[PDB]
Write a protein that binds this DNA or RNA. Structure first.
Ligand SMILES: [Mg+2]
Ligand SMILES: [Mg+2]
Ligand SMILES: [Mg+2]
Ligand SMILES: [Mg+2]
Ligand SMILES: [Mg+2]
Ligand SMILES: [Mg+2]
Ligand SMILES: [Mg+2]
Ligand SMILES: [Mg+2]
Ligand SMILES: [Mg+2]
Ligand SMILES: [Mg+2]
Ligand SMILES: [Mg+2]
Ligand SMILES: [Mg+2]
Ligand SMILES: [Mg+2]
Ligand SMILES: [Mg+2]
Ligand SMILES: [Mg+2]
Ligand SMILES: [Mg+2]
Ligand SMILES: [Mg+2]
Ligand SMILES: [Mg+2]
Ligand SMILES: [Mg+2]
Ligand SMILES: [Mg+2]
Ligand SMILES: [Mg+2]
Ligand SMILES: [Mg+2]
Ligand SMILES: [Mg+2]
Ligand SMILES: [Mg+2]
Ligand SMILES: [Mg+2]
Ligand SMILES: [Mg+2]
Ligand SMILES: [Mg+2]
Ligand SMILES: [Mg+2]
Ligand SMILES: [Mg+2]
Ligand SMILES: [Mg+2]
Ligand SMILES: [Mg+2]
Ligand SMILES: [Mg+2]
Ligand SMILES: [Mg+2]
Ligand SMILES: [Mg+2]
Ligand SMILES: [Mg+2]
Ligand SMILES: [Mg+2]
Ligand SMILES: [Mg+2]
Ligand SMILES: [Mg+2]
Ligand SMILES: [Mg+2]
Ligand SMILES: [Mg+2]
Ligand SMILES: [Mg+2]
Ligand SMILES: [Mg+2]
Ligand SMILES: [Mg+2]
Ligand SMILES: [Mg+2]
Ligand SMILES: [Mg+2]
Ligand SMILES: [Mg+2]
Ligand SMILES: [Mg+2]
Ligand SMILES: [Mg+2]
Ligand SMILES: [Mg+2]
Ligand SMILES: [Mg+2]
Ligand SMILES: [Mg+2]
Ligand SMILES: [Mg+2]
Lengths: 195, 113
RNA sequence: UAGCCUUUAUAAAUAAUAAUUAUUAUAUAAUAUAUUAUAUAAAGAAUGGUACAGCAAUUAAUAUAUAUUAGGGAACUAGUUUUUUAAUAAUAUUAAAUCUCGAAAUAUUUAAUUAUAUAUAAUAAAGAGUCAGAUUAUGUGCGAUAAGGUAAAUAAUCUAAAGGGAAACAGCCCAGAUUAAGAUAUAAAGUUCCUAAUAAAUAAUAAGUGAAAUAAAUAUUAAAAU
RNA sequence: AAUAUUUAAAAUCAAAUAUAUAUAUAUUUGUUAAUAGAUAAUAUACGGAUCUUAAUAAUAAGAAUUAUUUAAUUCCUUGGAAUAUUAUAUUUUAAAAUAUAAAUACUGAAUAUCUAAAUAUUAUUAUUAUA
RNA sequence: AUAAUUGAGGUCCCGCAUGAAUGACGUAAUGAUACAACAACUGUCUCCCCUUUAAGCUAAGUGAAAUUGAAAUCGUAGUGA
RNA sequence: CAAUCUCUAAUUGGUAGUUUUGAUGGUCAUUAUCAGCAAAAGUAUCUGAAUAAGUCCAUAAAUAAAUAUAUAAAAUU
RNA sequence: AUAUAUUUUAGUAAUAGAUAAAAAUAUGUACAGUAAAAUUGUAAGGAAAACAAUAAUAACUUUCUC
RNA sequence: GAAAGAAUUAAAUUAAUAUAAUGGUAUAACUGUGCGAUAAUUGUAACACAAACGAGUGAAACAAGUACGUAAGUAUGGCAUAAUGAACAAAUAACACUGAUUGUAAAGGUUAUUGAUAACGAAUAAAAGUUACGCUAGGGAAGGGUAAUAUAGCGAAAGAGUAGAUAUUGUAAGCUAUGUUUGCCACCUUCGACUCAACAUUUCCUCUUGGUUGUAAAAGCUAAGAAGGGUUUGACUGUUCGUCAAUUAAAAUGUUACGUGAGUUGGGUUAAAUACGAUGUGAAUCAGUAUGGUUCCUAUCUGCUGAAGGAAA
RNA sequence: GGCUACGUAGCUCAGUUGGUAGAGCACAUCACUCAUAAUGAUGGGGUCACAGGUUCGAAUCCCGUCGUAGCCACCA
């Protein structure tokens, strides 16, 4: 509903920033969560405007609405407010006025997701290709079995990466603050703190 | 047009004296906005929460179990002392005065009340 | 005026610059469950909150044949069910210059030790010039993730630096001309000829692709792996 | 053969290094190409020539492009050893045997060394005449 | 009005932003004023040709000038304050 | 009266000497807070601010609260 | 029971607690305590007036008691 | 087993803080309450932080006095970071320091206090415009870069096309090229006509060819090759352009310092004169209108057009 | 920072050299009339501008602030 037009109460101008190249191997929003088939970015990290996203959504919908129990999950919201000065105006003299909403999209991230009752995968693939024709990146069809993109030419299965109880790890190799707390909890300090 | 071209300078609010550093009485160990560091052993605190040394010694940053979730800056009277000092041991104190070996000076001091 | 430069000197002078030690844990050995030594591992005294990472709280976004709160319809005889409309909850998933609960490296930075003394800091007495900067790389603000653009941050060079390379070249890659000499090591860059110097190996290309200034979505044809 | 993906060393396998060690653990490395798309005004414009190989047939050429490498090739631990190569000499019948060598690729600065000369400072001397 | 007119004259009045001695309006005459039309005329032009004289050119005599870092002073492309 | 001299006042582009900031098409110039600012400190531009400041707050809630009531004392009665 | 005199009371006014998030003295010092939101209710009361309620007691001290 | 106390643990700084925002604050810096109303006091302040100077900030300690607290102790205003202004000249007090011959005085000094210079390190007590009649010293304290726009192309194809997205058409969004427009940057300080044109091809005509239920024919439409040759004359306007008239096989689009002023012109743009409308108190002014109106050059080199001499043939 | 002199009713204005709530003015009802309205009469609201003293007795004098502005000072 509000993914292409956030309702920040205090509307305000924003700096340009940069699209996060996720050097640490994030895989956040790079996985199929809601649907069966999806459309992910394949190229270098890119900014997608609100209008472009809307058009992609519309393109996808043409295939989704005919389906029985058809659904489209829009995975990303255009949260960054972009202002622009005109091409007509000189440089300097303040910042330009609000123009459009935009989203910073890392390399591996999923944009859309679909799942119908009577949805064959070929149709879904076609729809997602047609959606990609309207967006500024280069995109890729992603199924539930197809594995998570991280880099431009690199891949990963989330099933593989290890599970860890971090409290236990902390206890094993404790910080100074934690040790101080533990000492405080002990009786030769707790009795004589005198509050 | 109307531009937002106005800002105060930076308040120089780092630590002004470091761990293991020799100090003198009066010297500022920390400038800060509110007690990020609390005044520890042999150390005072000012109006602007500025930690300053009460005695000559060695600046030490530490945690104390009595005050968990609070960082401290204190001044150890020597380099030998671990400055979160043992609680039930006697306080390491500085006399900090000198006897008036000079006779006249001693006499003057005796006279003065 | 300070910053940076110069001259002459001063010491109960190393205070300077660089690194190490400093911590945590493990194993072994020796003393009294602790201490010391040895070895190994760990981005390893103190200060920090950027990258990264994250969705906690704040601010934002999405979904539920899930629950509650009311509303609009609807079927039988005000009660009731369903298809729901919003809010709230629950569960799952997401991001931000002014969010950071996790969190680097570089950094700031302390003592002693070692190494730099044909070397540094500090102080004293005196002379300046300069206050139009430029480019390259990285991280940003503005611009349109435009400018040989603009604004500052860090480093280098040019400025004021000749020499070799980059065809030619202020700012790039090497390297700092006291005067020669030209045997030996070379730097960056090169070795068919122009032009100082070359031979091999294994693959791929057939397009003069390309051969020191890489042009995109997409299409076609192959090639591998499943 | 056919259909449909992916173009990957994360997983997986293979290979190598480091800790107890014929194994385990940890780390490091290995996963497409071509063409089209293609484009303006003095004149082709990799700096230019020119470079893509070919038996018969050479004491002889066969990328001068792209990618990964080496300094003849293969094992052992920069070094030695073996292997064939190449060149040469000797002996025997243009070939065979023996042995010697080459294997340090090279060019390259106003860099460094060497080789000499000058000035300045530091530290030692020698000669001649605040010695 | 012209084959055809952003010009000219006539007329209309959302006069962006006329107006009465910073005078208002309509005429006769005048004007090397400005714009437009008709007639006549023509080398203005279609489209230039021929001719004449003074230069230009050559020989003799006299004899400038601005300019000038030094010049042994080509094209193209590239580079580059 | 008026004229002249001396003093005093009004008026003056008549006339003379001067000036017309730095930044911009009325707005910005001093101070504070955050971001920009890249985990010390500092850090700019006609950069972004739901930006904020030229202050505000005081002489006041008092007095009374142990020898007391008739009579007699004054070792506390 | 009633008259006069002399007194006494009635000026009727909130805090009764070291008060603790209604409003009021904004700098000192001493002593003490904890807010808010949301939720469930309740006369007018309704989304929005007020009041109530809404985390855990292991160990310790004293008291009574099987 | 029960009651009461002491409390501890968890949570919380989301409330509250005189006031912005940030940091801090429950050990509370927040809140209540007693006393008080004092420390919102007086002389010396080292040493630090910050820092060009001027200033700014924290502050141990010594001495005098005060308030609260049993005491320990705490208080030199406010949880902190804003809340501001130099000298000079005046003014008011206190000080007992100087007292221009001596004594008084005046006047000056010391100490405390006063009002502003916001262009906020403040030039004076006190200062606005105009010039196209201008003057001097200097500085530059279309080309180049860019490609948002513009022009052209490509991919994908919603949708028109009597039916069929792709004969022809092709929304909004996607990927490029160009340097032909309007911009931006600031390294770098004249429009049109005439004359002669050279080059490009993204081709308007002519030649060849593919597609065209939308090629029967003929006219077309669209696309590929193709730059050999050719591609206008008039009315209006300074105009390029545009409107129209009459033609043409066609009347293509650019580049060349938007080719060409040491080749011509000078209508536009343009200074001095003048008027009009508007603006201004005015001098005068204008992304206004109108009439008038100033540059010249014998060619040294390059280059090109022709013509000779010398030369090695 | 000091010094003035003014601020009555919804409108306008008296009153002022003391022993006062008064006027016509626009506004709503009756009235003469064929029907308006001019004219005749109904009544209307003032803390005599916030707010204190001297005379049994001040809207008027002595004023505590409030307001309109005006003036001086300071203007370095
Ligand atoms: Mg992120
Ligand atoms: Mg700051
Ligand atoms: Mg200087
Ligand atoms: Mg040292
Ligand atoms: Mg930040
Ligand atoms: Mg943190
Ligand atoms: Mg840093
Ligand atoms: Mg400068
Ligand atoms: Mg200069
Ligand atoms: Mg620059
Ligand atoms: Mg210079
Ligand atoms: Mg240098
Ligand atoms: Mg050079
Ligand atoms: Mg040198
Ligand atoms: Mg080529
Ligand atoms: Mg190239
Ligand atoms: Mg691996
Ligand atoms: Mg070319
Ligand atoms: Mg080359
Ligand atoms: Mg040398
Ligand atoms: Mg007409
Ligand atoms: Mg005409
Ligand atoms: Mg007009
Ligand atoms: Mg008149
Ligand atoms: Mg007149
Ligand atoms: Mg005349
Ligand atoms: Mg020559
Ligand atoms: Mg004048
Ligand atoms: Mg911060
Ligand atoms: Mg900062
Ligand atoms: Mg910082
Ligand atoms: Mg806070
Ligand atoms: Mg410093
Ligand atoms: Mg100073
Ligand atoms: Mg406070
Ligand atoms: Mg307080
Ligand atoms: Mg002055
Ligand atoms: Mg005298
Ligand atoms: Mg100024
Ligand atoms: Mg100033
Ligand atoms: Mg002035
Ligand atoms: Mg004029
Ligand atoms: Mg250009
Ligand atoms: Mg259709
Ligand atoms: Mg389009
Ligand atoms: Mg063509
Ligand atoms: Mg036909
Ligand atoms: Mg031909
Ligand atoms: Mg031109
Ligand atoms: Mg010329
Ligand atoms: Mg006029
Ligand atoms: Mg004339």
């Amino acid at each position: 509903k509000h993914e292409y037009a956030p309702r920040f109460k205090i509307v305000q101008k924003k700096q340009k920033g940069r699209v996060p190249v996720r050097t640490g191997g994030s895989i956040k929003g790079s996985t199929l969560q809601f649907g069966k088939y999806g459309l992910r970015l394949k190229s270098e990290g890119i900014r997608i405007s609100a209008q472009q996203l809307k058009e992609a959504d519309n393109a996808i919908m043409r295939y989704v609405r005919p389906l029985n129990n058809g659904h489209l999950w829009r995975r990303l919201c255009t949260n960054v407010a972009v202002c622009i000065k005109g091409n007509e105006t000189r440089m300097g003299k303040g910042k330009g006025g609000f123009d459009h909403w935009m989203v910073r999209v890392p390399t591996g991230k999923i944009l859309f997701e679909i799942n119908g009752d009577d949805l064959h995968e070929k149709v879904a693939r076609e729809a997602f290709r047609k959606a990609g024709t309207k967006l500024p990146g280069v995109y890729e069809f992603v199924s539930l079995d197809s594995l998570v993109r991280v880099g431009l030419h690199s891949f990963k299965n989330p099933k593989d990466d290890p599970v860890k109880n971090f409290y236990d790890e902390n206890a094993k190799k404790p910080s100074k603050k934690y040790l101080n707390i533990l000492k405080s909890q002990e009786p030769q300090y707790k009795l004589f703190r005198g509050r | 047009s109307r531009t937002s071209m106005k800002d105060s300078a930076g308040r120089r609010l780092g630590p002004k004296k470091y761990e293991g550093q020799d100090v003198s009485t009066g010297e500022i160990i920390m400038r800060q906005r509110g007690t990020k560091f609390y005044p520890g052993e042999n150390v005072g605190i000012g109006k602007d929460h500025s930690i300053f040394a009460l005695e000559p010694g060695v600046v030490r940053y530490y945690l104390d179990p009595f005050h968990p979730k609070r960082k401290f800056i204190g001044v150890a009277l020597r380099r030998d002392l671990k400055l979160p000092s043992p609680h039930f041991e006697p306080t390491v104190r500085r006399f900090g005065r000198f006897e008036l070996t000079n006779k006249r000076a001693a006499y003057k001091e005796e006279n003065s009340i």
